[PDB]
């Protein structure tokens, strides 16, 4: 039969097969369920979509058409939940907030 | 020259679907590859720990959902749980 990707089966852009292979080779459990790579690929896709959309909005407000680590740093540090998720993370060439009051 | 295997093309499809005209630099792609890898190790480690605590030998979507609820703060967890449940439901129906 014609081969169909599990990413296309799940309606995702992230690789369900590669996430499955990294879950098997990553020494996390003896077995990996079928829906676990689908769930992980969906969660990773949602997180990259949210950070990329906020960084694209920051780049649009900075009148630029390219996302740089400064735009990524602005997008993450201007958000409570993203800053709680990535509090102990240094973004190279990210800078700091302009601390405008 | 030995198949470095990044997430760059998938981050590109996601970027072109949420912002069809903006681009991204190679530095920002490296940042975002590191982000995807870091979140992968966090969620997989929490799910592995949950499966070890409950004396299971398999990691399932229940373990992934509980790891997401433990690690992501606030409405991020709710929206990621919705996205994962939607993708698993779409995958099961094929």
């Amino acid at each position, epitope marked *: 039969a014609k081969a169909k990707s599990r990413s296309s089966r799940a309606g995702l852009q992230f690789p369900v097969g590669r996430v499955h292979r990294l879950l098997r080779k990553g020494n996390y459990a003896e077995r990996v369920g079928a829906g676990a790579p689908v769930y992980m690929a969906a969660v990773l896709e949602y997180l990259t979509a*949210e950070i990329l959309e906020l960084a694209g909005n920051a780049a649009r407000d900075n009148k630029k058409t390219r996302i740089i680590p400064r735009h990524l740093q602005l997008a993450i540090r*201007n958000d*409570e939940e993203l800053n709680k998720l990535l509090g102990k993370v240094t973004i190279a060439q990210g800078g700091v907030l302009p601390n405008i009051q | 020259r030995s198949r470095k295997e990044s997430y760059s093309i998938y981050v590109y499809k996601v970027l072109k679907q949420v912002h069809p005209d903006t681009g991204i630099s190679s530095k920002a792609m490296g940042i975002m590859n590191s982000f995807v890898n870091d979140i992968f190790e966090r969620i997989a480690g929490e799910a592995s720990r949950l499966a070890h605590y409950n004396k299971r030998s398999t990691i399932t979507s229940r373990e992934i959902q509980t790891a997401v609820r433990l690690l992501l703060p606030g*409405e991020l967890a709710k*929206h990621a749980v*919705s996205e994962g449940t939607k993708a698993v439901t779409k995958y099961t129906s094929s």
Partner: single-chain antibody
Amino acid sequence: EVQLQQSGPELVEPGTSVKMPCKASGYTFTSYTIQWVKQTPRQGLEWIGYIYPYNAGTKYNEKFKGKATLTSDKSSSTVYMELSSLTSEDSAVYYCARKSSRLRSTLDYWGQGTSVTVSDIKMTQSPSSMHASLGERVTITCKASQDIRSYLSWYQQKPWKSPKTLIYYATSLADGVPSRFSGSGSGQDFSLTINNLESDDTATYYCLQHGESPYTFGSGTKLEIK
């Protein structure tokens, strides 16, 4: 659990300034933006602006800059809004609503409304007023002007009550809303469907986009039962 307390009605003479609170409780106050919505009988719901109490960040509507000024007080978990130089066309009820910083989220919880009286994307709702019995299927169309990437919400407002969120992200059910309600559509075409009617469903239904920077509501659709 989540409550957004406001003040009473302000009988205010023209030319002065008015400030009203939006004291919030039941949730982590800095993690959610507080958005302000005005309501007039003449042109319906209108989005004014918001304050993000995490960094005191604001964004206003184009036509409310100078007319509106938003402030946050982190100590008492209270959001204040300043209206200055009150023109005769400012007699309205002002709602404050909670919206998360996520782009997918919407105004899920609202305040009761402060009636102050003085002494771009256009969203078209195809039905203006519909009538139904207690058991049929009724649909509501929310034809959009520009492309929005499924960033559309549906609200139900009883007469003289705060609006209640039904659908967010154009398909997802809100918290506590039953499976009877169902939303569909993406891009520019959107639809809200009610499975069967009850006497509770007699209300006015609005659709709100939050894709671009000025948030715009729909015209409104009155549903009458039997």
